[PDB]
Structure 1
């Protein structure tokens, strides 16, 4: 996480996009903050507010980060865009290319208490996209 973003803000940058460009473009926003291109990333085509509501759902064991049980499953599926790295050997991050996989899935988010810099409108916020189902 880049220090200038709260965990919730970084979650949104990586995983919330109502209308994302194709992955090779969309992923630049993330990979600019990296030495190596991210192997995979999912953008949920929804709103931050909608994800905050999912933080109020039943807490469960996190599927992909199993040391934690602050995860929450959406009650319904959302449209989304999955991005998969096609050229992992790549020179600089500007040269990374991604395959696009539009889809529609449930999601599982880890949620924590808000950063003091996050709006008091959400006492609890999503901080990781653990997986989609």
Structure 2
């Protein structure tokens, strides 16, 4: 459940965009604050919001994880990433979750939609979901 105070685009940036992320255990705290249980896995794309918006404006394709949607877009280049892996599953409380940091590099596929009235008018079309990385 995305917290109502944030638009889909804002929650996407909070969960998946970070050029220079801190350790996973630290970065994930803000995200787990709004959940019932700690997130098992989360990926941060080391790029800028502006760059993802550009990927939105390219060739459209069916979303791999949900082919009924023809609103996905694949990046042209592989981008560095930071995978955050949960260490204590079901174990420790949602207050003391620790993560392992794991670097990676690949293409990403995002679903994009029309901006929310609360979003910046500068970007008519914005990224709202990370479908997968290849």
Deviation string for 1:54-105 (max 9, x for gaps)?
0011111111233322110001111110111111113322211112111111
> Aligned equivalents of 2:114 and 2:91: distance in 1?
38
Residue 69 (str. 1) matches residue 79 (str. 2): no
Deviation string for 1:20-67 (max 9, x for gaps)?
111111111211110011111100111100000000111111112333
The TM-score normalised by the length of structure 2 is 0.94
The TM-score normalised by the length of structure 1 is 0.94
Unmatched runs of 5 consecutive residues or more in structure 1: none
User: What RMSD, in angstroms, separates the aligned Cα atoms of the two structures?
Assistant: 1.1
Number of residue pairs aligned between Structure 1 and Structure 2: 133
> Aligned equivalents of 1:93 and 1:72: distance in 2?
34
Where 1:24 maps in the other structure, the secondary structure is: helix
Where 1:53 maps in the other structure, the secondary structure is: helix
